Amino acid sequence: YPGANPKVIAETVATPLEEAINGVENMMYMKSVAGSDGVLVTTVTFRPGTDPDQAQVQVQNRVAQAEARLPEDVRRLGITTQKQSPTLTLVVHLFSPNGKYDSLYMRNYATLKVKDELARLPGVGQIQIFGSGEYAMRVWLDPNKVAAR
Amino acid sequence: GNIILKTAQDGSLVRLRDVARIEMGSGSYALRSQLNNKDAVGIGIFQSPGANAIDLSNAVRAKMAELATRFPEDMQWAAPYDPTVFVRDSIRAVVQTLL
Amino acid sequence: DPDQAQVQVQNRVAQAEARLPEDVRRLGITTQKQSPTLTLVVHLFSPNGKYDSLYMRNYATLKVKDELARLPGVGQIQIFGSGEYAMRVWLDPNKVAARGLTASDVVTAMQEQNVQVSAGQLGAEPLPQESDFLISINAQGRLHTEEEFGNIILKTAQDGSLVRLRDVARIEMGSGSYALRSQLNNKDAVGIGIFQSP
Amino acid sequence: ALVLCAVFVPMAFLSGVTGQFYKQFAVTIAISTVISAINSLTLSPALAAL
Amino acid sequence: AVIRKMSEIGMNTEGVDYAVAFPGLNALQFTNTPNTGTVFFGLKPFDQRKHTAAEINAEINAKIAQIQQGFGFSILPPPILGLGQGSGYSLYIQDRGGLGYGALQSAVNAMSGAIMQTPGMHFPISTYQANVPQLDVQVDRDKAKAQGVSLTELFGTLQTYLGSSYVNDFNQFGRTWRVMAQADGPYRESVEDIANLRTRNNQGEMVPIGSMVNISTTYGPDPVIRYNGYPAADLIGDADPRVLSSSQAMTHLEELSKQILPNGMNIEWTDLSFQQATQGNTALIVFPVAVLLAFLVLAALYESWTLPLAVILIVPMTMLSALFGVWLTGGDNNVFVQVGLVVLMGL
Amino acid sequence: SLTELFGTLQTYLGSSYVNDFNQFGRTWRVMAQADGPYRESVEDIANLR
Ligand SMILES: CCCCCCCCCCCCO[C@@H]1O[C@H](CO)[C@@H](O[C@H]2O[C@H](CO)[C@@H](O)[C@H](O)[C@H]2O)[C@H](O)[C@H]1O
Ligand SMILES: CCCCCCCCCCCCO[C@@H]1O[C@H](CO)[C@@H](O[C@H]2O[C@H](CO)[C@@H](O)[C@H](O)[C@H]2O)[C@H](O)[C@H]1O
Ligand SMILES: CCCCCCCCCCCCO[C@@H]1O[C@H](CO)[C@@H](O[C@H]2O[C@H](CO)[C@@H](O)[C@H](O)[C@H]2O)[C@H](O)[C@H]1O
Ligand SMILES: CCCCCCCCCCCCO[C@@H]1O[C@H](CO)[C@@H](O[C@H]2O[C@H](CO)[C@@H](O)[C@H](O)[C@H]2O)[C@H](O)[C@H]1O
């Protein structure tokens, strides 16, 4: 929910999602963390021995039922529901020794050329990428110049 | 930048670049990544239940090594953490203990 | 397998959603596997009439249902009687129309003035020099009380005065549903069915 | 071998995360015990006589 | 800037290969928070360095303790990703009575101090921090509407300029990317920058936001945390097994919380603690079953209901010898020791 | 327009879901409808404006 206060994310995004999810079979507990980056992460944890594919689909059914409750800008960006693969196998970094490339360039290099190649390898459960953000076309407005016209 | 916002008094077209700076930038500024104080991006590779961790780490390294032949010069990769060493050690220990 | 039937149905419903009327979609459709095996029926009731079914049903929703749903072996909890709280705006159509207003005007004003707000931050990137502080901003868009909903501004009259919702409507925290009632030995009640899982 | 299975195999049924750890040891040790007994009744005396 | 100083410290500590740094990353939640950062220090293989991980950690800590600009830490890692510790504990404090973010902060402070002064328990750590300075923009709705400014326009102006608006997508490099609109950073730095934003009334005139709002400083949490449907705060902490067991620790914290927390707050265990509090000890069945099964096998072998006892009654002595060696060397009774004991009893 | 005509029948006589609000820690609907005494007779229907 870009720009929204953590309190608004908790009240208008995390609260309806939790209301929908509440009651899913074999759930042990659930937590929501809403930050000033505008991002909500709600983590639903299930009893040991629960099939994680079954957990995934039941949570994605409840999310679908809440999606109509959500703020329009949240819905326009889209929500994701993803079972977690807890066993780390390897950390890999890309980096630039001389500084010719920055983290924005390298993260998007990983997204364009690396991640999908790794995700195809047998035995991979999840690939997580940490640092900078996907490219976006940024229009940086000067409000005085906008309002002058 | 050439998006048209309106017609001005004199008949000129007001463009987006007349009121904005436009750049291909980032979708998020909230998290940064460095490796030994160089700019970086980190990649966590998680196995599925039932995988062979040692084979998966080798396959990830081999794939990185193939991809890295096409990296632009001045971009490199590293594997700063490999927790498959722990079960590799246990296997080595079984063989040494048996001997 | 009831879980396979549930998922296959829920994914077909998801595909039907584009065909449904807009108002049905905005409320949301639910798909739920049924748990056939009842274990216990529990009621709340008011001996001396201090509380009605609307109060007791929402007490159960707020205070009971979730604590029951965590007990080992529960498959489904069903609540029977009254409905969820809803903020009810009961329009007098003669007064609305006398102010020159349509029902659609009223709905639009209520959607304008009870809304989620994104207020932004000061000191976020990009800056030519390094910011020292990131300050989040708060702005209240949503309303909470009957009084606040009654103070919604439907229009400005010709003398410039503000026409309020409470001037054309009676506003109350009421029921989302009047279809089903619940009594227990002729006292107001709400019923709770606890179903075990297999 | 049965006495050792009587001791070890119930240890595969303990609760919680530690129970999952105990199961890894208990089942592995019970297997090796049974196979070693098989070997002790077959290959080992056969080899000794030979 | 502080993370980069910590990275330099770790990089210049003998035995450290890498400073894997993430300014922004809150390690307790793995979400992003602007006043938090994480940096992992990757160690050389033991045989390429002189010092142990504990020695290296102790050295880094002495150096980062000299950084005045924030509170830096370096700790040993858990043996298992996704469970955390083993003797410690994890709980949330939940606010169930609508007491608000400030009372939750006071509850956190009060519990954390009381825990810090329990012997064998250090100050727990929390993601929660309700005293983050913020700003509150109080909209005079009557005055906006009286002059023809709709709240959609007013709110929308704040949202796009100060918060950014997702516009739509475009394609580049063969992929889909967002298009975003926002004020450039220099125009959203000050309270006056907010007040000078202009919206338009129904007459077409440009109206400054500042003429329809009151801006004041306030405080709020970042991030906001909820647990099982309630505003909440996490507490992660240690409990020294040589002082108190995890079970005594949990019992103490339950009692502390009953004395300290105001009516309408409570604690809930999570992660490994939730499992301990909700698991029964099936050893009370498993151990007698194991002894009875072994007795029965021996009663058959010996055709005697009494001779099995000559075997069964000696096994406590092996358990005693093993634990005595553990005790004499300062060890604990961890799962590797526990299986060692049972294998020795089998021998 | 039929949109206005049908919309008038729907909100006054059938109720319209407006949006949501928060109270007691939860989400609830906001609903608009004529009060009951204004939707009892066929004349009440005809008199909607
Ligand atoms: C180098 C670290 C290696 C991985 C260690 C992870 C173990 C931690 C366990 C907690 C679970 C992590 O949970 C993981 O959180 C991160 C947030 O940080 C999410 O990932 C997010 O992080 C950042 C935030 O800007 C973006 O770069 C990324 O694209 C986004 O997806 C993952 O989609 C989620 O799977
Ligand atoms: C041949 C292999 C046999 C292996 C069996 C050896 C041990 C057999 C069972 C251990 C005896 C008690 O069994 C188990 O003990 C452990 C540790 O003492 C307790 O464990 C408890 O304390 C530990 C740490 O103090 C916590 O991390 C744990 O979550 C908690 O449950 C369990 O509650 C109990 O169920
Ligand atoms: C030199 C490079 C080294 C890179 C190392 C990569 C691994 C780093 C692991 C650091 C974290 C280990 O500690 C781990 O923290 C995470 C995050 O709090 C905890 O995870 C917990 O919170 C996370 C975050 O919300 C939730 O997904 C979850 O409900 C819970 O399991 C783990 O239970 C704990 O075991
Ligand atoms: C705003 C909306 C409100 C949000 C709703 C909040 C969600 C409520 C949390 C759900 C709690 C589930 O409740 C919890 O269920 C778990 C998982 O089955 C059970 O957990 C336990 O069950 C048995 C007990 O021996 C064990 O086999 C199991 O391993 C153990 O985890 C507990 O008995 C119960 O404490």
Residue numbers in the entry:
A (entry chain C): 51 to 199
B (entry chain C): 250 to 348
C (entry chain B): 101 to 298
D (entry chain C): 448 to 497
E (entry chain C): 597 to 943
F (entry chain B): 746 to 794
Publication excerpt:
OqxB from K. pneumoniae was purified and its crystal structure was solved at 1.85 Å resolution. The asymmetric unit contains six OqxB monomers/protomers and each monomer is composed of 1040 residues. Similar observations were noted with all the other protomers of the OqxB structure. This analysis demonstrated that all the protomers within the two OqxB trimer molecules are highly similar and are in binding/tight conformation. In contrast, the OqxB structure is symmetric, wherein all the three protomers are in a binding/tight protomer state with two DDM molecules bound to each protomer. The OqxB protomer substrate-binding pocket is located deep inside the periplasmic cleft, between the β-sheets of PN2 and PC1 sub-domains. Surprisingly, two DDM (n-dodecyl-β-D-maltoside) molecules are bound to each protomer of the OqxB trimer. The head group (maltoside) of the first molecule (DDM1) occupies the hydrophilic pocket close to the exit funnel, whereas the second molecule (DDM2) head group resides near the entrance formed by PC1 and PC2 sub-domains. Irrespective of their head group position, their extended alkyl tails orient into the hydrophobic pocket formed by several phenylalanine and leucine residues. The hydroxyl groups of the DDM1 terminal sugar ring form hydrogen bond interactions with two positively charged arginine residues, R48 and R157, while the second sugar ring interacts with the three glutamine residue sidechains, i.e., Q46, Q134, and Q178. The charged arginine residue, R157 present on the alpha helix of the PN2 sub-domain, is unique to OqxB and forms hydrogen bond interaction with the DDM1 molecule.
